[PDB]
Amino acid sequence: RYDKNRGQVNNLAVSPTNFNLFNPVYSQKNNFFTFRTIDYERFSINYFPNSITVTKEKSLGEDIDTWTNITLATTLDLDGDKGEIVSLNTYNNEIFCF
Amino acid sequence: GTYFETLILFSGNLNFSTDYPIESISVYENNNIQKVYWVDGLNQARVINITKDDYNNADDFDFVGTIHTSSKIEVSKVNGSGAFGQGVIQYAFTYYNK
């Protein structure tokens, strides 16, 4: 409650316009970091043979190594009817995927 | 090494004809979802996962799914908790395999 008409003996002109004003934000839960249960027998896949992740360009400044920070936010999936990604190579400024 | 491990994925009345042969595409997405799409010039296009051996009817291969059970879904309105906008609301349901 954000009104200053609290604990005063006058209380003569108080009203719901002045007396019990309220700021709801302080009644906030720990909602930002929330979790849930998972079923062990449920089959949710974790294998992506035709998929390529891409990290951020290394800043080469005093911060984290972008290579070690993998976010899966810039993925790329090749055709799956050829086969799994056996090898990825670079030759003359161009990446070529076997 | 020396023999073909042969399995029968289905045996029934999928309407085929020798005058309308098969033309197929197959993809590898994971160790369990290995699909084979195939089409005749006469009948509907169909799908089969070759890592599954419980195909019991000819409607399990269509692009659109099939419903075997008689789903009974009743929707009732609870009052007191929630946050909605004034008006009428209608709920629709549909199965979909992952």
Add this chain to the structure above:
Amino acid sequence: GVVVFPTLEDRNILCQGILCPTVANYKDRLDNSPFVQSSWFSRPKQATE
């Protein structure tokens, strides 16, 4: 520790608060126009006589 807190629908206790006696004008109980009505003043019980 990790918990699921109850919603307003599955709560056992809805709320907690004091109980205030009401008042009623003779005429108006007998005409049911107000019957019972809220008190100007909070009427607490006394612990002794």
